[PDB]
Subunit: 200 residues, 3 copies
Amino acid sequence: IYPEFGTYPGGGESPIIPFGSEKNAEREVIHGRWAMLGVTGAWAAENGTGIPWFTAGTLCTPDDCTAVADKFPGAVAPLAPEGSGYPSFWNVLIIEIVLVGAAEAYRTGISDSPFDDGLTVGDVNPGGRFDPLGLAESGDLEELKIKELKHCRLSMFAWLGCIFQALATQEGPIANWQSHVADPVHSNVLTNAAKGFGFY
Amino acid sequence: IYPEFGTYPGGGESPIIPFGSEKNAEREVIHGRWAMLGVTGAWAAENGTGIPWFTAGTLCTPDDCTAVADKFPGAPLAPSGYPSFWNVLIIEIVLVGAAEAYRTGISDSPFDDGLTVGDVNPGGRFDPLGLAESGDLEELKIKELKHCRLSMFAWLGCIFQALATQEGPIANWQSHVADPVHSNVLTNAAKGFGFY
Amino acid sequence: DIYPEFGTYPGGGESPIIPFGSEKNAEREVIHGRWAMLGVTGAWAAENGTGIPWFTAGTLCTPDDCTAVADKFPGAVAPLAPYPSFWNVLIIEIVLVGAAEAYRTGISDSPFDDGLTVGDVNPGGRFDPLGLAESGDLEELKIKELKHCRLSMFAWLGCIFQALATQEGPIANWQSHVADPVHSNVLTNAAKGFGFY
Ligand SMILES: CC1=C[C@H](O)CC(C)(C)[C@H]1/C=C/C(C)=C/C=C/C(C)=C/C=C/C=C(C)/C=C/C=C(\C)CCC1=C(C)C[C@H](O)CC1(C)C
């Protein structure tokens, strides 16, 4: 259901853009799960540490990646020994791209499917293996599907936000949010347009 | 008649961007009217006041929109710092929200005048002179969409130019007329847009 | 395996991303890319011959005059200028290119009328002077040109993008990258902030 605006892929069509390829539905949902994780990560990283997500791109560089050690709120220990440099960027990126590429190739059937029970390639939400808690079978899986997709679109809008705010304010989404909640009259996009977004 | 590149929706129907729905034709002509009003409003704003159109909002302020009071040439817009930005905004939100709800039909009908909800240029009521019936309607809609498209392209130019020159549309007009060959787009790029 | 790269060619198979139903854009991709390949190729050739970036090569010429190119070419036995004037080369450029466009798209009559249909992107009847069209099979050679066409369009997009980020020039960016690839790339230039941040 979409009383707010638009509709879901199963029924109806967007007047703003024709449906086109089907696989856009699959593409949209995965994009949204990713933006959910990205926005939440931006939110929580800048909540605990304070640094914006976009600046946090340089959180690890081939010369400087041991900086990340113990950069987590309340973390029991640092990620790696402090000042060792053993948490090199080369290592952490290699491990990352290995685990991601394996997950994505198993997702899309590039390589194989290690699990032998269904798990059809090309589905948003199989739920054989990727539902350990049984909340889909518990009920309202379809309601949860609409809920999922709406959270997807909201989070992609939020991520497009966080990108835009970075491009204009250069301050970070939570810092912008705190500034807006403190004095909403004089902390908005248009007063930043009046200052000229820095570039003007 | 539309003897120009492309084709009006419902005619020959040969678009660059695929014709997804009629509703895009509706959005084009409605964007076109608002861009018509935007272009002529900017033109009159800065030939009268002398400021860039985009800074007009900057000249108004939430605390003092009396900064824009009586900016109109040849005319007391308001007597005290009475005109507030929220004041004009709440009058505004009511009027434009009514008019839009009335146009699309989310609210009830204003009147039982034979009007068709959701259709452009229905005419009759919205034509006090009756030009729609006095002239043949078809070529008149062609002119409607043609001027709509021209003003939209003008508005796209004005926004991108406010981004480029940072001086406003008359300033581009004046820079271009006083020196056509130099002080143009490619000289502005040559000397830099202020960033390079 | 002809075109195992991502996607499919316009003649056969629907795209993987953007659906389409018009053959006009299928024509247009290959001409846009051909124009790109000439642009990108000239990017190296010019930037290597003169040692300046292509985007400042545009403004090297002024409306008042265009003499900067005189003896700017590498190995020129005689400079092209002896009227090194922009408008003198402009009218001849716009007339020659305009005529070419009219002749290739059908605005004006073809000067040869050798059967080259303007609608056809491959009027080999007068084109491919070497005659490689008939020396080898045409289909594979269509694919090869197309692949390069897409390659060079993406390279032009990336070229212009790097132009806007670093303003140092595509091949100067290349030299900086190969000099120290670890600490010279898009992400370290974004760490500097592309100059604007
Ligand atoms: C966690 C975190 C912390 C670190 O510190 C830094 C870090 C970078 C690592 C970071 C990690 C980041 C990650 C993983 C991000 C993932 C992002 C993703 C996948 C975003 C998706 C973005 C999606 C967009 C734009 C879509 C736009 C589409 C739009 C508007 C149109 C929608 C639309 C449709 C089709 C039909 C309607 O009817 C009408 C309209 C036209 C409106």
